[PDB]
Each structure stands twice: as C-alpha cells, then as structure tokens.
Amino acid sequence: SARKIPKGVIHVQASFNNTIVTVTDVRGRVVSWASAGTCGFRGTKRGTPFAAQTAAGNAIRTVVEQGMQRAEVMIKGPGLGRDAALRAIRRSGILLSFVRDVTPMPHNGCRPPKKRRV
C-alpha cells in the first residue's frame, strides 16, 4: 500500500471564516486534507489560532500511511491561522524545509465589499 513520496508542500488557505490545511506532494497532487469546520466545532468557533492547530493535527492520522520525512510549508491569505498551522505541523513529527507566503497581492484593481470580519 501507499505511494511513499519523500518531501512535499503544505498549502494552508488561511482565511477569516476558517482555515483549510492541505498537505500535497512535489508536483501538486493532494494525498488527503483537513479543515477547521471538519474537526468537531462549526459555525463561528473556528478561524481562531488554537482551532487551527486541532485542524492541522487531524491530517497526521490520514497522511501517516504515506510516511513523509521532510515537509515544506506554504501559507496563503490573512487571518488567525498563519503562524498557528506551522506550530502544529512542527510538534507532529515532520521536519521544516521551506516556509513561504504565496498570498495574492493585488495591483489595485479588483475590490470586494467593506464588511466587518471575525
């Protein structure tokens, strides 16, 4: 069983409502994912930093079948789950290699509504 891929990039879609932590390989194929509204609590109880750690710590139950040694991290977008997702992945067992911020910086053109966030 399993493909047994060495290292891989971890795409963390950090938003205000929730945080989707997905651990993918070298190419871009997802093995298994984990989210904030999946781990027990839902509604508005998520999106917080220590709710992101229970989400990123739920991935090591489904991706343990592959057996990854090293891991590169990748954060996208603002919110309370940027530095928190990196701390849970570190206390799990996998090593650090490349932490990058691929947040889409606009060239001042497209603008969404004002509205207050959580």
Next chain:
RNA sequence: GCGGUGGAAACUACCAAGCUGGAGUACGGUAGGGGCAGAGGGAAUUUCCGGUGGAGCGGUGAAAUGCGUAGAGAUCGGAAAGA
C-alpha cells in the same frame, strides 16, 4: 445748465518721431500622470478542460439562501477574456 468768443496747457485725449522696465519672439537647456493615437508588459480575479484527492465549502454579531459525493472548495497544469 447750454452755446459762442478770446486765452491757458499741467493732466486726459488726437497726430508725428522715439525709448524701455510691460508684453511677445528667437537661441540653448530642465521637470512634469498635460493631451490624442497605436503597441506591449506583470499580478490577481472569473470562466472552460484535465490530474490528484476528500466531505465539506461559502458566509455572519449569530445563521440561513447558495455551491457539494451527476464529488465543490482546496491544489497543480493549460487555455480564454475583461478591467
């Protein structure tokens, strides 16, 4: 107040000949999202197709409408298009 006559002449005005500080022009340079037209560049968003993969995603002061196992979101590769 109006008209006429005889004067005065600085000022205003008319005429003639000038002068120059006004203004204008040329010579040589400087900065600027000045304007019009035609190209081309980068990020991102949306959409279409395909791969991986899982049940959730989206949203709010809370929720719900909505999008989801005819499998989105997320992720990767490619395309199209507009600002």
